[PDB]
Structure 1
Amino acid sequence: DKATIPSESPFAAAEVADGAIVVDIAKMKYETPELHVKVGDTVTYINREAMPHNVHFVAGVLGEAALKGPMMKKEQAYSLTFTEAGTYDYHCTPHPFMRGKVVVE
């Protein structure tokens, strides 16, 4: 796959790793809707608002299967470690008007 998943569970915002590239979620938006990272970087999404959100990549984007990330409650987080250059678009499953992308380069 073009990304690996360190934790299938969401985890606490305080548990975010040094060196992770953070995208905050608040006001029903991904706060960095276009993020540029390098191969091998870990991107960590952190939900900063009461409304639960996830990240969802359709099939073929990160690998053969869709990746429907777990729902993050407020102050929960979720990571992906990207292993291949490319453009990876995602959305929020319950809120598909929320869109972003990670460009790995």
Structure 2
Amino acid sequence: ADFEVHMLNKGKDGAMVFEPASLKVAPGDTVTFIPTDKGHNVETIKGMIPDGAEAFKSKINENYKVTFTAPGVYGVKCTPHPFMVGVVQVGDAPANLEAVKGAKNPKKAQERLDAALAALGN
């Protein structure tokens, strides 16, 4: 299956956001990150992806597609916007949950990550 995540200045969930900011996918599914507004990108957060997964980074304004196969949670961020974060999860019972959950990001960013993990049923 293929999914889209849009990058927005303001969305359903607030300002500088990925929409949706949480997505549960099956191994082999893809996500394309699509700028709806100018000035955003996506990159994996250091330490916040599964073993077996590769880090990634897009260019500002780039439509950027990633295939997710390794099970677990994937923390993503937009480089210029400190609170603009999200989580993609592959499968159930992610093994690296604490890499995201126990992290020490700015409160607004961390709340967004934590709410994403909670919405994913963790």
Q: Same fold (TM over 0.5)?
A: yes
The match for 2:71 among 85, 91, 102 is 85
Comparing both structures, which one devotes a greater share of its residues to helix? 2
Provide the aligned length of Structure 1 versus Structure 2: 85
* 1:55-101 Cα deviation digits (max 9, x unpaired): 2331462558973412232xx31011111211111111221211100
The residue that corresponds to 1:32 in the other structure is: 20
Q: Is the 8 A contact 2:50 2:73 kept in 1?
A: no
Tell me how large the CA RMSD over aligned residues is: 2.3
The residue that corresponds to 2:49 in the other structure is: 61
For 2:68 and 2:53, locate their aligned partners in 1 and report how far apart those are by CA, in whole Å.
Answer: 15
User: Where does structure 1 differ by over 2 angstroms across 4 or more consecutive aligned residues?
Assistant: 52-57, 62-68
Q: Is the 8 A contact 1:44 1:78 kept in 2?
A: yes
Q: Is the 8 A contact 2:50 2:72 kept in 1?
A: no
TM-score, length-scaled by structure 2: 0.59
TM-score, length-scaled by structure 1: 0.68
Larger Rg, first or second structure (1 or 2):
2
For 1:60 and 1:34, locate their aligned partners in 2 and report how far apart those are by CA, in whole Å.
Answer: 14
The residue that corresponds to 1:96 in the other structure is: 82
The residue that corresponds to 2:116 in the other structure is: none
For 2:70 and 2:44, locate their aligned partners in 1 and report how far apart those are by CA, in whole Å.
Answer: 18
Q: Which runs of 5+ in 2 are unaligned?
A: 10-15, 92-122
For 1:29 and 1:54, locate their aligned partners in 2 and report how far apart those are by CA, in whole Å.
Answer: 11
1:55 alignment partner AA: E
1:47 alignment partner AA: P
Q: Which runs of 5+ in 1 are unaligned?
A: 1-18
For 1:68 and 1:82, locate their aligned partners in 2 and report how far apart those are by CA, in whole Å.
Answer: 11
Question: Which of the pair has the greater relative contact order for Cα pairs under 8 Å at 6+ separation?
Answer: 1
